[PDB]
Design a protein around this ligand. Structure first.
Ligand SMILES: [Zn+2]
Ligand SMILES: [Zn+2]
Length: 216
């Protein structure tokens, strides 16, 4: 099941029962997750800006007839924290590491909570979510998200898609450490099923290996 807005700039694809992938075009696509829980909707990453973020939120709240209660910000770039102003005015908790919170302020964005530690486990209803900071890579602050009940890993921009031959913006990246950080993710999660890249189609652990290949 895939749902889109009339313009086609926002789509939501179902991965499983309560897990969907949201994609917005900035055209340049960016992925995130929508988790449908018994106590509201939880998103992994917002969108490019406040307009798209508001649209995304309105779209999912209308579909599931629930409130978006929390959002996990994976790093301080527009495709992830672009709609932070929209989140705060709607009472949506914007979770992030302390580092992401300070880099956000530095990039002219309002500040997220800065509550996430290196390993943080959250439970929304019956939905379990684990956030993990593997080290510097695409950015100094990038984190990954793990759904242990499904063995689904949200790689974010730390992971490139199968067709990608470019690492993207590396002005804020730590290219040399990036490989070590991906290795930390591989060592931590031994049995991965699906892997969601920052941009592109959902794949498997092969995407992490592919990214390591690009980094060589
Ligand atoms: Zn980025
Ligand atoms: Zn990216």
């Amino acid at each position: 099941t895939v749902i889109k807005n009339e313009t086609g700039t926002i789509s939501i694809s179902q991965l499983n029962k309560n897990v969907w992938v949201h994609t917005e075009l900035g055209a340049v696509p960016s992925n995130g997750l929508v988790l449908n829980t018994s106590k509201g909707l939880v998103l992994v990453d917002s969108s490019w800006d406040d307009k798209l973020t508001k649209e995304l939120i309105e779209m999912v709240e209308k579909k599931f007839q629930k409130r978006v209660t929390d959002v996990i910000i994976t790093h301080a770039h527009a495709d992830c924290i672009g709609g932070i102003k929209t989140l705060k005015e709607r009472g949506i908790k914007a979770h992030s590491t302390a580092l992401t919170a300070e880099l956000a302020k530095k990039n002219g964005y309002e500040e997220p909570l800065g509550d996430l530690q290196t390993v943080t486990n959250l439970k929304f209803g019956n939905m379990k979510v684990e956030t993990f900071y593997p080290g510097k890579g695409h950015t100094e602050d990038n984190i990954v998200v793990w759904l242990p009940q499904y063995n689904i890993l949200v790689g974010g921009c730390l992971v490139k898609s199968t067709s990608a031959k470019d690492l993207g913006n590396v002005a804020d990246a730590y290219v040399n450490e990036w490989s070590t950080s991906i290795e930390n993710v591989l060592k931590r999660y031994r049995n991965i099923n699906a892997v969601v890249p920052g941009h592109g189609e959902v794949g498997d652990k092969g995407l992490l290996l592919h990214t390591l290949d690009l980094l060589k």
